[PDB]
Amino acid sequence: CTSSANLEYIVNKSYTKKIMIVAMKLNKTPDQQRLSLSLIGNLFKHSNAVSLSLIETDVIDHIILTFKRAPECPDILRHAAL
Amino acid sequence: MSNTEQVAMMHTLKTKLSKYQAMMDKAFEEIAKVEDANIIEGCTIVRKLMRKVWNTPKVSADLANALCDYLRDRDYFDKLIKMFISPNTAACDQVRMECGKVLEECTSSANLEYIVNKSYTKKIMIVAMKLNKTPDQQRLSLSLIGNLFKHSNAVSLSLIETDVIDHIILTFKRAPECPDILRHAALALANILLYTCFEGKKKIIQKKIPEWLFFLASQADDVTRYYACIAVCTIVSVKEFEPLVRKSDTMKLVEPFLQVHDPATFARDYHKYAQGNTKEWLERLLPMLQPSRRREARSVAAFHFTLEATIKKEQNKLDVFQEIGAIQALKEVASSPDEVAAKFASEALTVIGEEVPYKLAQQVPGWTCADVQYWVKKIGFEEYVEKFAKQMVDGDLLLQLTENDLKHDVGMISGLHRKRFLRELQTLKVAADYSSVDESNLDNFLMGLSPELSVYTYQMLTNGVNRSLLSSLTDEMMQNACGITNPIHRLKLTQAFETAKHPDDVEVAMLSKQIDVFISYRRSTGNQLASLIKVLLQLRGYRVFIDVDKLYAGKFDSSLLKNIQAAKHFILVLTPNSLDRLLNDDNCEDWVHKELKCAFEHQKNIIPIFDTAFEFPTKEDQIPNDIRMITKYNGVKWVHDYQDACMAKVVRFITGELN
Amino acid sequence: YSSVDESNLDNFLMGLSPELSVYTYQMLTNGVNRSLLSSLTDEMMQNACGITNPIHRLKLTQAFETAKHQI
């Protein structure tokens, strides 16, 4: 459901960082990790200010650790590279 | 205007630009000291300068624009923004005020675009919401807020997320003592509605802004009313929201508000606020002239374009209406039965110095064959016009035209052409005024069921039907004599006389399902409070009727008393002086007396609402004997500070608990 | 039809069965709305709404068959 308008809705309602942190909590399995990197990457399809604001979460380190943990899943590497 | 004047303007512009750049620098040197009084004084000078610039007879807009550019180029604009949003400004709120006032003057389209490009928008918005401690702060706040709302749909929608609409509502609810607050509120609402998408409009409606626009349009201030009329007509321009505005009653204020003004006189009144009206904001108003829109919206748009034509004559930029093509739409409206809009559109074209096409009267039965010819022409049936002329068709005969008459006497062989033609004729039939002939207000009655039914008006009227007879009609009479072949329409009329045997009994039965509460008040004193009460009750879901829309000289609406009879509940807003015109009114000449007498005659859950300053008249024996008893009733003391509790008490009197 | 359909009659008809969308504009332009449908006779439907197909009339009939239920 991460349409441009749905990502805009997330931003408009300021759910962005809540969703981000909860995506960072989705880490327990490769499925969680893939979904996490997906939602993370999807939030990164909003405008410059939003991406910059999300850099302040240091999720980049979480991303690195996530793909570094489970590179044996191509879908993790996809959602990371995405 | 001459090329000598173009030169003189350019010269004056360059000259005064040079001057005001230097003076602005001096004021910016005071700001750049970063000391309270110096920032205040510098900003005061810039404010005075910008207003004087806007008051400069001809070059005003260009000079303002050039100075807005200079302010960006000098980073003066950027510095003001930064100094305005600074938290340290709490050292002296008057610094924030003067910075903000200057920013308000300097909110040109390019300056607002700069704000958006630098992403200052929400910072400024929040700091405007913090400007709340005085009516001055509140006015400035509403100003900056409204100015931000003069920018593209996404920005307005983004700002809706701040819930500033509730802050706006609370601000004018707190301080209705200030007309300028109501102006900047109505401005903000007009701007945001004009500069937002469907989704944002829906959100604004969810803040029940149609009700608040009733309140705003019921203010005594013509500038507030103008903006409120624009704002509601912007809403009314969308089909889905017409019922919501109908429930607000606000449309009913619109045409009367226009009728009591001349656009050029209002332009001269409005000028200080007209300064900085914009092309794109006109381009967004242009759709409100369209034949798809309400008569109200077209009338507001036409009046507004007359006002703009006036102001653009003064600024010598009438070319804008050619650039946006509005001249064509004005000609279309001038050649329309939207008589009010047509007049204003003709006047607009007059101020543009354009031709005024042939006028059309809403009283279409009165039409000459020349009128018919012109109409037929305009609706594109030009090839038949000669035959219409030969057939000598008039305002009467047009209204009778069956397909056969077209087929044979007009020789219109194409059934499709006939269909097309008849669609226009039906439209016209609906649109037409039949007060020319309708002694019985049958048309009004039918309109109350649905205006759609007005198609049948002329037929029935000419067949000798009147409002009193309607209960007695059979399906056959309806079908045949009234030509109502549509059984659904026949069913509708059946549903009228299913309820009762007499049109007044039927209408009072209907009206009961449209009126919970009737509000009586004294027009010269109670207007604002009565409207606030109406709006607050409408926000609480109650269907409220009120006498706001001015009746003419004499000729009182007895249907006002039918509205009271249909109501469950009756409010009397007891202002200072509220009962004074009832004194010695034994003949019940006062309409407040007629209203209150009717309320007593029907025991409508009767609610005296005492305004905060109110006292009863000195001499109770001089209040007429029939209504004097009201001096013994319980009522709600209104308190402006405790509006919510007072309204809770009003609800108790409505639920019959305290009366 | 949302351009003109205040009542979401279009939506209703689609939900009832998609093909019935075909009738929307006729009945809408005759001044029918989502509330009134309960009140129509087979005759009114067949004539005014031009739904000559009795099967279609039966379908919408099923909607109206089913659109019910100190001392």
**Which one-letter amino acid corresponds to residue B601?**
E
Cβ-defined contacts of B275-281 (< 8 Å, 24+) = B275/B54, B275/B55, B275/B60, B275/B64, B276/B54, B276/B61, B276/B64, B276/B107, B276/B108, B277/B308, B277/B311, B278/B109, B278/B150, B279/B320, B279/B323, B279/B324, B280/B109, B281/B150, B281/B191, B281/B194, B281/B195
Distance from CA of A62 to the nearest CA of B (A): 29
CA-closest candidate to residue B546, choices B511, B509, B571, B578: B571
Percent of chain B that is helix, strand, coil (3-state, to 5): 70, 5, 30
Query: Using an 8 Å Cβ cutoff, are B496 and B449 in contact?
Result: yes
Contacts of B592 (CB under 8 A, 6+ apart): B520, B521, B522, B578, B579, B581, B582
Measured CA to CA, the distance from residue B466 to residue B442 in angstroms comes to 6
Measured CA to CA, the distance from residue C18 to residue B381 in angstroms comes to 38
**Which one-letter amino acid corresponds to residue B242?**
E
DSSP labels for B409-460?
TS----HHHHHHHHHHHHHHHHH---TTT-TT-HHHHHHHH-GGGGGGHHHH
Which of B122, B126, B157, B161 would best serve as a mutation to test chain A binding (most A beta carbons within 10 A)?
A: B161
CB < 8 Å to B489, chain C:
31
Measured CA to CA, the distance from residue B547 to residue B519 in angstroms comes to 7
φ, ψ of residue B413 in degrees (nearest 5): -75, -35
Q: Is C18 on the interface with B (CB under 8 A)?
A: no
Q: Is B488 on the interface with C (CB under 8 A)?
A: yes
**Which one-letter amino acid corresponds to residue B611?**
D
Tell me the CA end-to-end span of chain A in Å, nearest whole number: 17
Query: Using an 8 Å Cβ cutoff, are A71 and A47 in contact?
Result: no
Tokens of B305: 């374009």
Q: Taking CB atoms and an 8 Å limit, are B488 and C6 in contact across chains?
A: no
Distance of CA B648 to CAs B261, B360, B539, B644, B657, Å?
Answer: 38, 51, 13, 6, 12
Measured CA to CA, the distance from residue B89 to residue C68 in angstroms comes to 65
Of the CA atoms within 13 Å of residue B125, those in its CB half-sphere come to 23
Contacts of B405 (CB under 8 A, 6+ apart): none
Q: Is A49 on the interface with B (CB under 8 A)?
A: yes
Per DSSP, the three-state class of B637 is strand
Measured CA to CA, the distance from residue B274 to residue B51 in angstroms comes to 12
The alpha carbon of B233 is separated from its chain's Cα centroid by a whole number of angstroms, namely: 6
Measured CA to CA, the distance from residue A52 to residue B410 in angstroms comes to 72
Residues 146-175 (B) with a CB less than 8 A from some CB of A: 157-158, 161
Per DSSP, the three-state class of B79 is helix
Residue A55 DSSP symbol = H
Tokens of B456: 């049948």
Cβ-defined contacts of B267-274 (< 8 Å, 24+) = B267/B307, B267/B310, B267/B311, B269/B222, B269/B223, B270/B223, B270/B226, B270/B307, B271/B311, B272/B51, B272/B54, B272/B55, B273/B183, B273/B187, B273/B223, B274/B307, B274/B311
Measured CA to CA, the distance from residue B602 to residue A40 in angstroms comes to 67
Tokens of B298: 């077209």
Per DSSP, the three-state class of B635 is coil
Query: Using an 8 Å Cβ cutoff, are B255 and B299 in contact?
Result: yes
Measured CA to CA, the distance from residue B135 to residue B219 in angstroms comes to 17
CA-closest candidate to residue B526, choices B655, B422, B638, B382: B638
CB < 8 Å to B161, chain A:
12-14
Residue B477 DSSP symbol = I
Query: Using an 8 Å Cβ cutoff, are B27 and B43 in contact?
Result: yes
Tell how many helices (H) and how many strands (E) occur in chain A.
6, 0
Q: Is C67 exposed, middle or buried (0-12, 13-18, 19+ CB in 10 A)?
A: exposed
Which of B491, B494, B498 would best serve as a mutation to test chain C binding (most C beta carbons within 10 A)?
A: B491
Measured CA to CA, the distance from residue B137 to residue B175 in angstroms comes to 11
Per DSSP, the three-state class of B610 is strand
Tell me the CA end-to-end span of chain C in Å, nearest whole number: 57
> E strand or H helix at B636, and its extent?
strand B636-637
Tell how many helices (H) and how many strands (E) occur in chain B.
36, 5
Q: Taking CB atoms and an 8 Å limit, are B161 and A49 in contact across chains?
A: no
CB atoms within 10 A of CB B496: 19
Tell me the CA end-to-end span of chain B in Å, nearest whole number: 68
Measured CA to CA, the distance from residue B576 to residue B597 in angstroms comes to 20
Distance from CA of B170 to the nearest CA of A (A): 22
Tokens 């040197």 label which residue? B29
Per DSSP, the three-state class of B521 is strand
Measured CA to CA, the distance from residue B651 to residue B655 in angstroms comes to 6
Q: Which residue is closest to A14 within chain B, CA to CA?
A: B161
CB atoms within 10 A of CB A29: 11
Q: Is A13 on the interface with B (CB under 8 A)?
A: yes
Tokens of B289: 């002239």
Beta strands in B253-404 (DSSP E): none
Q: Taking CB atoms and an 8 Å limit, are A12 and B119 in contact across chains?
A: no
Q: Which residue is closest to B154 within chain A, CA to CA?
A: A8
Q: Is B523 annotated as a binding residue?
A: yes
Measured CA to CA, the distance from residue C25 to residue C2 in angstroms comes to 11
Measured CA to CA, the distance from residue A31 to residue A1 in angstroms comes to 18
Measured CA to CA, the distance from residue B282 to residue B322 in angstroms comes to 12
CA-closest candidate to residue A40, choices A23, A57, A22, A18: A23
CB < 8 Å to C30, chain B:
486, 488
CA-closest candidate to residue B535, choices B263, B300, B214, B203: B214
CB < 8 Å to B158, chain A:
12
CA-closest candidate to residue B26, choices B10, B13, B43: B43
DSSP labels for C1-70?
-TTT-TT-HHHHHHHH-GGGHHHHHHHHHTT--TTGGGG--HHHHHHTS----HHHHHHHHHHHHHS---
Biggest CA-to-CA distance, chain C = 60
The alpha carbon of C31 is separated from its chain's Cα centroid by a whole number of angstroms, namely: 11
Nearest to A49 among B119, B157, B161 (CB): B119
- Contact A/C (≥3 CB pairs under 8 Å): no
Distance from CA of A11 to the nearest CA of B (A): 9
Q: Which residue is closest to B162 within chain A, CA to CA?
A: A12
Residue B609 DSSP symbol = E
CA-closest candidate to residue B564, choices B504, B532, B520, B498: B520
Sheet holding B544-546, edge to edge: B544-546, B517-521, B569-574, B607-610, B636-637
CB < 8 Å to B153, chain A:
none
Distance of CA B16 to CAs B43, B56, B276, Å?
Answer: 19, 10, 18
CB atoms within 10 A of CB A13: 10
Measured CA to CA, the distance from residue A34 to residue A41 in angstroms comes to 10
Residue B623 DSSP symbol = S
Q: Is B1 exposed, middle or buried (0-12, 13-18, 19+ CB in 10 A)?
A: exposed
Contacts of B572 (CB under 8 A, 6+ apart): B520, B521, B578, B595, B596, B599, B606, B607, B608, B609, B630, B635
Q: Which residues of B545-582 are buried (b: 16+ CB within 10 A; e: fewer)?
A: bbbbeeeeeeeeeebbbbbbbbbbbbbbbbbebbbbbb
Measured CA to CA, the distance from residue B332 to residue B534 in angstroms comes to 38
Residue B481 DSSP symbol = I
Tokens of A64: 């690195």
Q: Is B487 on the interface with C (CB under 8 A)?
A: yes
Q: Which residue is closest to B485 within chain C, CA to CA?
A: C48
Tokens of B618: 């000195």
Measured CA to CA, the distance from residue B132 to residue B147 in angstroms comes to 17
Q: Is C47 on the interface with B (CB under 8 A)?
A: yes
Q: Are strands B569-574 and B517-521 parallel, antiparallel or unpaired?
A: parallel
Residue B280 DSSP symbol = H
CB atoms within 10 A of CB B356: 16
Per DSSP, the three-state class of A70 is coil
Select which of B308, B347, B507, B595 is catalytic. Answer: B595
Residue B283 known to be catalytic: no
Measured CA to CA, the distance from residue B324 to residue B328 in angstroms comes to 10
Q: Is B208 exposed, middle or buried (0-12, 13-18, 19+ CB in 10 A)?
A: middle
Q: Which residues of B411-439 are buried (b: 16+ CB within 10 A; e: fewer)?
A: ebeeeebbeebeeebeebbebbbbebbbe
Residues in chain A, overall count: 82
Tokens of B359: 């006028």
Measured CA to CA, the distance from residue B585 to residue B105 in angstroms comes to 53
Per DSSP, the three-state class of B277 is coil
Q: Which residues of B452-462 are buried (b: 16+ CB within 10 A; e: fewer)?
A: ebbbbbbbbbe
Residue B631 DSSP symbol = G
Measured CA to CA, the distance from residue B270 to residue B143 in angstroms comes to 15
CB < 8 Å to A13, chain B:
161
Q: Which residues of B138-160 are buried (b: 16+ CB within 10 A; e: fewer)?
A: bbbbbbbbbbbbbbeeebbbbbb
Q: List B521's β-bridge partners, or say none.
A: B573
Tokens of B146: 């409204």
Measured CA to CA, the distance from residue B396 to residue B412 in angstroms comes to 20
**Which one-letter amino acid corresponds to residue B574?**
L
Measured CA to CA, the distance from residue C27 to residue C48 in angstroms comes to 7
